[model samples]
Target: RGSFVEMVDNLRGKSGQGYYVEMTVGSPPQTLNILVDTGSSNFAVGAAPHPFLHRYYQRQLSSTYRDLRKGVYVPYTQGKWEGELGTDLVSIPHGPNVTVRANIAAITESDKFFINGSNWEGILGLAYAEIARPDDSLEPFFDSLVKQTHVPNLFSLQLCGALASVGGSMIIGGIDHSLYTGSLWYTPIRREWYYEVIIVRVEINGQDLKMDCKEYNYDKSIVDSGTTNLRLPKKVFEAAVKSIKAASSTEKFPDGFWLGEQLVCWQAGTTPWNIFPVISLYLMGEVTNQSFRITILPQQYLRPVDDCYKFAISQSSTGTVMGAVIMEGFYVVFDRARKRIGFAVSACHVHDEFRTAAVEGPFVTLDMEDCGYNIP
Candidate 1:
């Protein structure tokens, strides 16, 4: 039940689920907006008609569609889908506009990945091809774009914010310096899959968590734009929760609050946010003794549905998966060619009069290898 569709069901009757990039596919062209997920790699779309998808990718109508007819099944930590793999001419109507014959899984069957009343039609993966379904050889959409066109081997994402007026943009191939302030600080991309990286520490209201850095990266720390919350592996999660509970002015926030079994609501304009503590995550730098810290305010972690609020950090059996809640706080640049990821203070951080996020340092980084050796 922990997924984009289900957790997305976490905030209902809102603007939409996460973010979508409107792209046209096929011969004469059939347009559809697909979810942008940094965690996933298969560009899967609704091929067969589905109630959730306001529109489906009409295969037959795309005179240029090449049905490879390969049966493909892609499973996630949440839901799964079975579909056919094929190639087609795809065009991103938005800027960084370049069309390419990209691989796609025309989904004919799925379970809970897409839901009723959601705005996104399908998922357009933006991660590396290392985890691509069917085979690693199956190049992801953005990979195809770079190789087939003049677009740079990089892309940046800035979500207007979950509670903001519902807006965001993905700049393909290059950085838009205007989208962010100061200079961008980057961390090495530890692995090609799911934008993996090493996490150094976690802080709540400026108090450093009393945990071995390794605990924060039990399995692997990743930046997952597909998920709705900030998820931490068990030990780190409990540690963070304990710190937060002790730091918060309010006491005994029901068991349901931490478990996502209840929605806490208040008047539309008023807030209880001031009572919550700020949370910060420090990530590894390219060299030892250097790290970058990204902070998230309650505005981003607490999902705001009009006046109703939902807890935005949850438990993950694996490592920390920084999702939309964290991503919306900064301008994240995925630089594949350079094997690094950059973070900057997003201009959109100031929303509804609240500065929702922040970034600090190039500071002292240490004990960096306590949990760095990762292998299954």
Candidate 2:
């Protein structure tokens, strides 16, 4: 089910899965795998007792794992570990088995690694260095690999699948244009990768949702390649969903009302639901106009779920996360070297094929809870 062939391909594209590249203490080559993540800045892997180690740990015997007693340590707002400022080589694998290395940090303590029920081995922070004082930034990682590699390192996403293990590739070199169908639209990424955006306005279905993005700054809305769906503040999330629910002509589900399989349905004689109403996100002078659409996954189509509406956004959640879903069919570039992350819209074609394939496969469907949620 895993992307054995795709991983080997190593072509740059957007991915739903986030990875940490590691080299074993005595191993000859580097290995990469999905790493646990919180939107904050830190890069730590699962290291086991010497000799016989967990397969997940990136063996780093030749690479020195420095103890930064002299470096600064910052406590996460929510998580188990307090992160220390230190440096280590992070091997980012490029296409055709090429490898590039960058100096990254070791985070021993954080909620990401030590969550109570989670099986997370470690976390790699895609955030900026200003958050990690006394630590050399992630610039070397981006500049050497994405920029210097002579390939446009725009990160793209293929997130609308059944499971991460099935077949989703996180491309590093650049995005795949063939998967999309429309002209792209993009907003400038602020100088600070995590610059807090004040969402002054939000409109869904031509009706102004009764929510304001005024005080919504909580370090949540930033673009994270590691996550799946957009996590929004309770108020903002509710207003958006309410507008969609109200506008849609729903069919009765065994559990409740359900939207149809198609995104923008305007079939004659049927109540027309135009999901193309622009969903606006305003941060400072920058405005992100999301062309919205709704695709439903029937209970039968879902990967075995505890509930029918398994894909619905969960409120009571604090931070707002822009996950792989938000970047679907878009060429999203994360310039750690430049401290910027932006995306250009593409035709939403790949996700349909991806979802169809996943539903017809031998897959273990895991919920969002299966992946530990990071507190904002």
Candidate 3:
């Protein structure tokens, strides 16, 4: 019986871009638009750009703001944030009636990644307390919410596809059954740091691909809402990419268009659904021996840019990360109390025109008009 808060897909042209929610900070209640990230655990503000940058938290102006005299540094794939640690009264729209005084990192300086063009003013980490840096002693925002207010220990995400008008909802303390269809498939958390799950197998057009499930001593992968594309181990990524190239009848670029040697792109309209293969990921179940399969249609794997379409997959040496692209069109629930995660096909995507047309098929065809976000 918590509450549901609306999340805005701030950037309409990019897949995997972070969703935003409004938060009021300090005594005067200065509102800040912050990105909702499950991959990290540290609520931070300040570091965007000029016009958008001014919306960050102002410690001196707020009477309730208190500096802890401790500094912190957080790093990402592209950039990082360096700042001081502090505490303030943080309030979310539709959250508990009581304002929760939460520990936050007030960013003072940031790299090019922070200064880049983004609609969000800051980031709100929703991961576990174990991942918190500098001082794990400070209670996280959600943890504080559960202890201080009537909020529960659970939160759910109803993430929409690229073209949805209303982004989605982030329900605190409960699940929204109306957002999803079918029985919720629950999977045990393999790791406490990230929302890690066991990936049993990977398939492309009914063909099984080799993965290091046994040899690597584990079959784990992280479900990250903060990232945009699917990231797999080196060998698996190369093998998947090779399989895709072999199946494609459309000609590829001689040099092969690549995004930092991770993803490849092709001329738009040249590569059709017939040439692309449907990818499937089988996840291990917690309760029963039964496994859950998440199908990735061709339209979900290819992002159409201005004149080219980029593959929505990447290579990661660190481990597997199922990013937002693969998570779209699903209502995902993260149950900390049960130490499990549940998901079901979102009703929004199930009734969409694209899904309706490809109901019987393994993949969906995409046109220039259907592509909502463009890769830079």
Candidate 4:
């Protein structure tokens, strides 16, 4: 038997997105703010000076850093970076005090990846090795941690921007039950790449889309923390918009509102969420009939900007991404050991006016009978 140490790290960000944590690297200890991304695998940081970065990691200054001399490249949906691979002594403060040799990508070039508005100087990917670039056997940070420190394969996340703080914490190696109210609702990982899952049905304002479910999952579906919105496949987005428009009293909508290109501002103290509808998702488990429903009220998707709230749902060209808009409503657990994902009602989902997140049922039948179940 052995004693395990779980790491608790603080995350900082604004408006419930772009969260990053501080990490100490190299011999003399140069700390950097690395974005906590479940969507990527490469642990990359700015190796050279860039306009967007407040500071870059000076590779030469890090005495413990080693130049592997292997070229690596990672392309994100919004941006891309290419750099050289290397090894560095890395340690997280408030974690196990031991230092681990970790793989790092020192990027010299980037395109649209480094934005001036965010504080992250790097990206710390917490995904599986399959997404790892340049074909290294042990490249991913989580994989390296498991090999070196043997931290638990599972980790839990709670982004508590629902409250005023606009920040949250990450618990590595285990779950913190106190952050959630009820038992976690489980869904099997259909695939290893990007925490993929089966999305059974999507509802708008308690009304089912009633169309083919595959539309909701065009090419694939994943739970990606790096994304800011609940990105639905184009068809699903269209369907959702049509349903939402009808349910919201057929209110004449502003152009580019749902596209997230424009904002709808109201009086300084106006509560716009009262007119919006709740979004619900039915995620299937191993058994098709056995499913759990996760609901998000308007408060979860309407992010405040200046005096307006921006719509947080978008049309995905490739696949559906369960992003910050949805994850903020629940405390999400990536149980790699069990090959499943867990979601529970986050304690932060509570507002004095109304609730933002809700979970119900492991129903024998996914769709509601609403009446008799064909007893005749």
Candidate that scores best on TM-score = 1
- Residue 163's lDDT within candidate 2 is 24
The lDDT for every candidate, in the order shown, is 0.80, 0.40, 0.67, 0.78
Question: Sorted by TM-score, highest first, which candidate order results?
Answer: 1, 4, 3, 2
lDDT score at residue 88, model 2, on the 0-100 scale: 48
lDDT of 1 by residue, 79-172 (tens): 8898998999998777544679999899999997896777767888888888888888899998888889988788788776642436677777
Candidate 4 residues lying further than 4 Å off, grouped into runs, are: 1-9, 136-138, 162-165, 286-288, 350-352, 365-376
Estimate the lDDT of model 1: 0.80
TM-scores vs. true structure, each candidate: 0.92, 0.59, 0.82, 0.91
Residue 112 of candidate 4: its Cα lDDT?
A: 88
| Model 2 ranges off by over 4 Å | 1-27, 30-32, 36-38, 49-60, 63-78, 82-89, 94-101, 104-120, 133-140, 143-160, 163-166, 195-201, 210-220, 248-307, 316-319, 335-376
Candidate 1 collision pairs = 7-10, 289-365
Please identify model 3 stretches exceeding 4 Å from their true place: 1-16, 47-54, 94-98, 163-166, 214-220, 250-255, 258-271, 350-376
What are the per-residue Cα lDDT tens digits for candidate 4 across 281-363?
Answer: 88876465688889998777878772687888889886888988888889898988899999999887634375457887776
- lDDT (0-100) at residue 124 of candidate 3? 81
- Candidate 2 CA-lDDT value: 0.40
Per-candidate total of colliding backbone pairs: 2, 16, 0, 0
lDDT of 3 by residue, 110-173 (tens): 7753534555677788887888876578667888878888776888876665532336667777
